[PDB]
Ligand binder design. Structure first.
Ligand SMILES: O=[N+]([O-])c1ccc(O[C@@H]2O[C@H](CO)[C@@H](O[C@@H]3O[C@H](CO)[C@@H](O[C@@H]4O[C@H](CO)[C@@H](O)[C@H](O)[C@@H]4O)[C@H](O)[C@@H]3O)[C@H](O)[C@@H]2F)c([N+](=O)[O-])c1
Ligand code: NA
Ligand SMILES: [Zn+2]
Ligand SMILES: [Zn+2]
Length: 376
């Protein structure tokens, strides 16, 4: 049966509209599992061509939601192209989401000593990147590349592949150049709206849903979420990002549930899709060799017991770095791998239990995502 949908892009493709409609329905029946770099990075994969994942090697199915970033789209594409892997994911009925770790438009010519010129260069660059600002052409080059990529992102029948495009995330912190010490709330909203407008109207992107994702609030109120919210005319997906402690984390898990509940209630009221766009044990704790072998079980149990938080469409965990990160090298991964270390520490069992849970949805559990009839 056709359902009526209201997207940021009133001219979005039918598959894009179908994706939205699919999540609207599915979200009250399951929570999909997402994973950054699902088929491009893994501790146990032997090909990064889009056909394998650590998730698959752990549980026998791929994540339903495949996360990537503009680090694979905008020059210099440090994370490498992903067109082929996105296409493989879409062909298996997966859902694609792309975040945006854009370089700093004010300082990107100064790259050399990390983090200068990157997302992590905290030099405020919002004011100088909006129209009238000296660095607006630099930001526009990024957006041009995102648009060209989207506009050519086609399946074997020549139809555009939908993508959930997540702009200027984690913006209630100040580690990025678009953060809260770097912009007034209005300036942040203008940056987000300008960017969406540029992609949709100036460049003609028709295969994006737009997500907004601040960090978790410890004072969980609608007013706090709304402070930097770009507005219902500009967002399709209401998310948030949260990273917690590996130990003594009950209060943190409660906060996860509270934030998920808030976005779920807001989403119902506003005609949006609520999600947890990033969640995980904080990287430093994993990098120190620490583990919580009940983490996934805690996550699913807490979320699905809550009548609001359970209504999220998906949650996504971060990348499984194949050789970790510079420490020597230290671990930096979120999906427990099918390997002796995760067998022995109990994390594999934890994840396998999460997979077995009736309420989680992996790629074979989602069907008919893109062929649902819709009205506007
Ligand atoms: O609480 N905080 O302060 C906080 C929380 C979360 C943050 O970031 C979010 O969490 C994940 C995991 O920590 C973080 O992961 C990084 O992701 C980036 C992008 O994929 C990786 O950086 C890239 O790595 C490749 C290869 O090394 C390079 O080619 C790229 O140029 C780029 O440097 C990085 O290694 C991590 O995996 C994400 O950033 C996510 F938003 C942050 N925070 O500062 O980011 C703080
Ligand atoms: Na759900
Ligand atoms: Zn239903
Ligand atoms: Zn994020």
């Amino acid at each position: 049966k056709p359902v009526t949908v209201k997207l940021v892009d009133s001219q979005a493709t039918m598959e894009t509209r179908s994706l939205f409609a699919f999540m609207q329905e599915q979200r009250r029946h399951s929570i999909m599992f997402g994973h950054q770099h699902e088929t491009t990075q893994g501790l146990t994969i032997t090909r990064t061509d889009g056909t394998q994942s650590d998730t698959f090697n752990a549980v026998g199915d791929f994540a339903a939601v495949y996360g990537w970033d503009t680090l694979s789209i905008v020059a210099p594409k440090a994370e490498g192209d992903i067109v082929a892997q996105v296409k493989k994911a879409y062909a298996r009925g997966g859902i694609i989401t792309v975040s945006s770790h854009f370089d700093n438009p004010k300082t990107d010519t100064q790259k050399g000593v990390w983090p200068v010129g990157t997302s992590w260069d905290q030099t405020p660059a919002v004011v100088d990147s909006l129209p009238g600002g000296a660095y607006n052409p630099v930001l526009n080059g990024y957006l041009d590349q995102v648009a060209e990529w989207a506009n050519n992102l086609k399946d074997e029948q020549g139809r555009l592949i939908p993508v959930i495009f997540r702009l200027y995330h984690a913006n209630t912190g100040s580690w990025f150049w678009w953060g809260d010490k770097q912009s007034t709330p209005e300036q942040y909203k203008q940056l987000f709206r300008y960017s969406v407008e540029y992609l949709r109207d100036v460049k003609g992107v028709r295969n994006f849903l737009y997500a907004y994702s601040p960090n978790n609030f410890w004072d969980v109120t609608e007013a706090n979420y709304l402070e930097r919210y770009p507005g219902d005319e500009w967002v399709d997906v209401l998310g948030f990002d949260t990273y917690g402690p590996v130990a003594d984390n009950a209060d943190w898990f409660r906060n996860v549930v509270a934030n998920a509940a808030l976005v779920a209630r807001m989403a119902e009221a506003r005609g949006k899709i609520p999600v947890i766009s990033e969640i995980g044990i904080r990287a430093p704790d994993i990098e120190a060799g620490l583990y919580d072998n009940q983490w996934y079980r805690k996550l699913i149990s807490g979320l699905k017991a809550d009548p609001d938080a359970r209504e999220i469409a998906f949650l996504l965990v971060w990348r499984n770095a194949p050789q970790g990160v510079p420490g020597t090298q230290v671990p930096h991964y979120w999906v427990p791998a099918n390997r002796p270390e995760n067998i022995n520490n109990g994390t594999l069992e934890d994840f396998q239990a999460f997979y077995a849970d009736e309420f989680t949805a992996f790629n074979r559990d989602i069907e008919q995502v893109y062929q649902r009839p819709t009205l506007i």
